[PDB]
Design an enzyme around this catalytic site. Structure first.
Site, short mmCIF file in Angstrom:
data_model
loop_
_atom_site.label_atom_id
_atom_site.label_comp_id
_atom_site.label_asym_id
_atom_site.label_seq_id
_atom_site.Cartn_x
_atom_site.Cartn_y
_atom_site.Cartn_z
N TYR D 123 -5.71 -14.93 -9.28
CA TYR D 123 -4.64 -15.68 -8.61
C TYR D 123 -4.86 -17.18 -8.58
O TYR D 123 -4.02 -17.95 -8.11
CB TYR D 123 -4.40 -15.16 -7.16
CG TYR D 123 -3.58 -13.88 -7.04
CD1 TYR D 123 -2.97 -13.29 -8.16
CD2 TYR D 123 -3.42 -13.25 -5.82
CE1 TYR D 123 -2.25 -12.11 -8.07
CE2 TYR D 123 -2.68 -12.08 -5.70
CZ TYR D 123 -2.10 -11.52 -6.83
OH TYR D 123 -1.37 -10.37 -6.71
N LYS D 169 -13.00 -1.51 -8.92
CA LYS D 169 -12.82 -0.77 -10.15
C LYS D 169 -14.00 -1.05 -11.11
O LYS D 169 -13.82 -1.30 -12.31
CB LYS D 169 -11.49 -1.16 -10.75
CG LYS D 169 -11.03 -0.33 -11.92
CD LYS D 169 -10.69 1.13 -11.59
CE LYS D 169 -10.39 1.96 -12.86
NZ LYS D 169 -9.65 3.23 -12.58
N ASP D 200 -7.53 3.08 -7.59
CA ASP D 200 -6.50 4.10 -7.83
C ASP D 200 -6.61 5.32 -6.89
O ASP D 200 -5.60 5.86 -6.41
CB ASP D 200 -6.47 4.55 -9.31
CG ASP D 200 -7.83 4.91 -9.83
OD1 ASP D 200 -8.89 4.57 -9.29
OD2 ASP D 200 -7.86 5.56 -10.88
N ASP D 224 -3.71 -7.26 -2.54
CA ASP D 224 -2.31 -7.67 -2.51
C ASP D 224 -1.41 -6.46 -2.56
O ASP D 224 -0.44 -6.35 -1.82
CB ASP D 224 -1.96 -8.56 -3.69
CG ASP D 224 -0.64 -9.25 -3.52
OD1 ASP D 224 -0.19 -9.45 -2.39
OD2 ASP D 224 -0.01 -9.62 -4.52
N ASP D 228 0.63 -4.07 1.11
CA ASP D 228 2.02 -3.68 1.23
C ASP D 228 2.24 -2.16 1.29
O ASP D 228 3.14 -1.70 1.98
CB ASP D 228 2.82 -4.30 0.11
CG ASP D 228 3.18 -5.74 0.40
OD1 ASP D 228 2.85 -6.27 1.46
OD2 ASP D 228 3.85 -6.39 -0.42
#
Ligand SMILES: [Mg+2]
Ligand SMILES: [Mg+2]
Ligand SMILES: [Mg+2]
Ligand SMILES: [Mg+2]
Lengths: 336, 336, 336, 336
Positions: D123, D169, D200, D224, D228
């Site tokens: 980011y 990951k 995942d 991120d 949500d």
């Protein structure tokens, strides 16, 4: 007391090193040097006898040794020198370029010392094919390595003409070289005569007037190129000495390769090897502060310049017709 | 026909360029050359008269123009040249190194042509500070840019001594330079005498024997350095012309700067500029296939060579004592 | 005629696959399918008998095969699936998420299909430690792969509800995802109902109302995450089928691992495997256009939904108390 | 004491914030809190009154302020929040996911706390177009940023259920995520219940059983997405508070936007905002070690929970039919 691991190597290595032990012994005697020369095997002949270029037994004798003094290695040069550099963290690559009487018939007053960062830049191998026809390579430059290389620069400058030039290309590469040039300044500025030059300009200036330089501090790549240019100007690339200095371990060697075409003909030039020994002595003076070794360095370096000025026993590579034996004898007589 | 945007520039630019129009005009009528010269304003002087270094009315004219002919630009050089080179994709940077009989050489007669990739490599400025004191640059090498520069290398070789040398460092950068060298081979191998040399060897061989070289094809960075080394060896950096060639637009300029210190004294040397004009004519030939342009090129190159050989009206930068008007006049008499 | 390489694998693989051959045979019969099932060895048992996870003999039978139908593999899953994917270039990873009666007691109307790019992004492994404590990874995304994945999206959308959603994060990653979203548009826009959603929003929207989605086209990573979430919503991750489709070769498998804890207890759930066979049939309809295979896919998929709706013979993983044998029998009876 | 820069913002911002001052004032006198609120103007309304979205007079005040409390900002949200987060180094992004008795959950009672690294990863926007149709992003993971986010994870865990889960990951990104996970361990292992989960799996386990989670420590991107997903599962995204915590500056805002469509109708829900205030008090406790702030935090959180449980005066976004004034009043009666 220092313990030096002696490597004969391949091609003309065996001829050059083994016949040079006479001088290595005459100096321990004349200046009472406490140096232990314990020789080990590494290169193409070691790969044929054993299975590795750097045999298990050899690595164990180098690890207990202070300095590594080697002659040229053959096809396996990359597995011997590189792997030996990154495990003993020998970051600084020193490359002097000094005019030799008789061979430099253009300038006559060259006295350069190139301090080259030897751990980062593009020479660490971080590259990939990201897409069809597209290759990306990473140039990584840190302030840690940048300050360490600068400190070495400061030490060599302080015992020479107190003049350093940081060479880079920060006008185009604002971030990478800009960082290198900033770390150069933190150390050098205010302690020596400091200036900055762009790499392309320095390449041109070495030709126009190389006497303007004393010490040069630069990055891995720029230094790879400028070094060779500098040596060739000073006279000859086949006469050029080289060093890789770390905090606890150093390595001294000639720049020239194994030279298999002339191997065994007793005409290989021992000069590059012998000047690297002169640096090795200088390194024993920074680690000991005993000026006993500095005396041996000046004495060996002036013996070499005297034989070159007389022109009576030089090897074919520099226009003579004498053998490697005759050249070593002339240096052995002017030693004392 | 061809339309040329003429830029006088700053410092000695106005003197050099305006006085050279006499020459540019005499050739157009001597060789029936359909070249239209339309001068535009750009540089420091334009930043103070108008508001921008490169005014909108200037860009409008350069857009319709085939070739950009310019004198030296002052402090705003980096904002003009670089931008125009990117939007008109002028990828090939040509840098000839040719000794002129008259000026001090000290290396013999050299005739070297360096062809430099000028769009990718490390100069596209893709670098960032990733962490505290850690910088990362990205080196980009593509098959596309590399074949294109090799084709340009082929054109120049074919009308010279049909010899090419790919300079790179694929021994250490296996992937990036390796891709460059592969592109170099699929285009050049079989069509010309082709060899490859490592950049550090080349930097040294350029001093040992530069006459071994004809056309050199290399990357952005390596070519940046070797170009300046080669121009010094041949003579001077102030006599050196430069070119940036794209497919539908080309730029020709001297390598030297504005030189404000001697502006107005009427002593600026027009050689570099006039040799650029000569290269321009050479590019007009490749585009039109009309040898009138090649005849104009040899005619101009020759005239300057004659005046240098005679040494009667040279400028003070090359040991003479004549004014910039005298040297232009002597080239004008040797033209007709 | 198709030739399918059948792999039993490890753990519950042998139980699941070998007992499923009854259904695989009943369908070749009922719908007259010309499929040749030639089984080969790969996994942890193959590493114990031979020395490689993917034996030389096995690779040679897969190369002459059209499709690969496998059950779960053990510890050696990474050397079997990954290496088999990049040599047959199986770029598209398909992940359907369909509500199963009885297991989805929250939504009931989920019908998602996730098309996931499986070759670039961050999953290609271009990472290094550039400095102390500093790690850099390269995210590489090309328009070539971006258009190929989109085309697959278009094909699945066209035979479903003509609705595609390109999922990304181009608001933050303007260049990488911005390029992916542009290539998405070149293909999809104007041929199907198109829209774009940000990855974080899609993660939230899958929970709020997953019925709003039909087909989703996204990148390697975002897709790795969204797939699993989607499957779990639809009911269960242990029931989820998976595929890796290429131009000339496809691979069908269950998502679940080898499950050594329950291996041999005759209670592993064959549902994931059997739904991947249903996709395999669908893939024989895109390559043949013979609707013979489409009929077999719908018939097998409705047989499965019928057993789940009755709840009389399910395995322990989904709240039943029947064995793998009993479940297969119920599907074999409702087949015809 | 503490000084707070209060920003009303746009859309429903002015209504929500101005009406909540009653509450902010009552607490300062009920718990003797030395908090000075000094409102500044910022957002779309400030871009039309003055000339900038973030006026100089605003920046001056936020510079001296300890905490930044803000309502939603309109179209210029991305220019304010992001800039302030970079110059005041507010690295920790806290995102609680807690079900409120009253609003529809359909997943049970969840109490999840996500701690997201908010400075590095992908980011920071280090990406470029390297070649035609080929884009490259750089993912940066450092030991420094990673230990810092793990320490913040430790603080929150210690005063919750003392359970942490590092999400990453590292199975596919061995180097980047591997360094993150190692930093996670040297700080958390031994001090709390510590486990690691692949992103995942987490995306799926958040749907299967979210009550297995307490504190989640993850990277910029993974956090991120999961943030949500977790807020939806718990309830709504419009009830969700957010925080950005630095060492010497913190920012507290609702997750919801300006919502221009309902501005002025007096129906905007202040819950998200008031829960941000509650978090702020929690941060004032860590800084001062004065539990008066923690008592003010529980007092406010409780009051809103009581009004939601009673369901007599809710806003239309959560199924109620009361005005934004009624809901604030009910929280004010449950306070004293
Ligand atoms: Mg080296
Ligand atoms: Mg340039
Ligand atoms: Mg995968
Ligand atoms: Mg953010």
């Amino acid at each position: 007391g220092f313990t030096v691991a002696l490597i004969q190597g391949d091609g003309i290595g065996p001829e050059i090193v083994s016949k040079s032990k006479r001088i290595l012994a005459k100096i321990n005697e004349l200046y009472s040097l406490p140096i232990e020369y314990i020789e080990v095997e590494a290169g193409d002949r070691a790969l044929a006898r054993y299975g590795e270029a750097l045999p298990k037994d050899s690595l164990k004798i180098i690890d207990k040794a202070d300095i590594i003094l080697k002659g040229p290695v053959g096809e396996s040069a990359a597995d011997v020198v590189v792997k030996l550099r990154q495990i003993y963290d020998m970051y600084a690559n020193i490359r002097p370029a000094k005019s030799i009487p008789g061979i430099d018939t253009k300038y006559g007053n060259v006295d350069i010392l190139i301090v080259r960062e030897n751990t980062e830049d593009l020479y660490k191998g971080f590259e990939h094919i990201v897409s069809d026809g597209v290759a990306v390579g990473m140039k990584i430059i840190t302030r840690f390595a940048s300050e360490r290389i600068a400190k070495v620069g400061l030490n060599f400058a302080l015992r020479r003409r107190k003049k350093v030039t940081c060479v880079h290309k920060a006008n185009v590469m604002r971030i990478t070289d800009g960082l290198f040039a900033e770390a150069c300044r933190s150390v050098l500025k205010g302690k020596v005569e400091y200036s900055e030059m762009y790499v392309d300009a320095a390449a041109a200036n070495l030709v126009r007037n190389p006497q303007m330089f004393d010490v040069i501090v630069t990055e891995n790549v720029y230094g790879d190129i400028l070094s060779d240019e500098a040596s060739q100007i000073a006279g000859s690339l086949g006469i050029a000495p080289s060093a890789n200095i770390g905090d606890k371990k150093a390595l001294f060697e000639p720049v020239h390769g194994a030279a298999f075409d002339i191997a065994g003909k007793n005409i290989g030039n021992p000069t590059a090897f012998l000047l690297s020994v002169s640096m090795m002595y200088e390194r024993m003076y920074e680690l000991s502060n005993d000026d006993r070794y500095i005396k041996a360095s000046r004495a060996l370096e002036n013996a070499i310049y005297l034989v070159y000025k007389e022109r009576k026993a030089l090897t074919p590579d520099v226009g003579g017709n004498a053998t490697t034996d005759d050249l070593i004898n002339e240096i052995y007589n002017k030693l004392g």
